[PDB]
Amino acid sequence: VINTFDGVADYLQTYHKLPDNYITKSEAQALGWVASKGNLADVAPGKSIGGDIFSNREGKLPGKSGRTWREADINYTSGFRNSDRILYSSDWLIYKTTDHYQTFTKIR
For the annotated catalytic residues, the residue numbers are: 71, 100
The method recorded for this entry reads X-ray
DSSP letters for 1-20: ---SHHHHHHHHHHHSS--T
Q: Using a CB cutoff of 8 Å and minimum separation of 24, what contacts does 61-68 make?
A: 61/87, 61/89, 61/95, 61/104, 62/89, 62/93, 64/91, 66/90, 67/91
- Look up the CATH number of domain 1-108: 3.10.450.30
Experimental structure resolution, Å:
2.1
Sequence-distant (6+) residues with CB within 8 A of 49 are 22, 23, 24, 25, 28, 40, 72, 73, 76, 81
d(CA 65, CA 48): 29
Count CB atoms within 10 A of the CB of residue 64: 12
Q: Give me the phi and psi of 94, to 5 degrees please.
A: -125, 130
Contacts 24+ apart (CB under 8 A), 92-101: 92/12, 92/13, 92/16, 93/62, 94/9, 94/12, 94/13, 95/61, 96/5, 96/9, 101/54, 101/58, 101/60
Is residue 28 packed enough to be buried (19+ CB in 10 Å), middle (13-18) or exposed (0-12)? buried
Extents of the domains making up the chain: 1-108
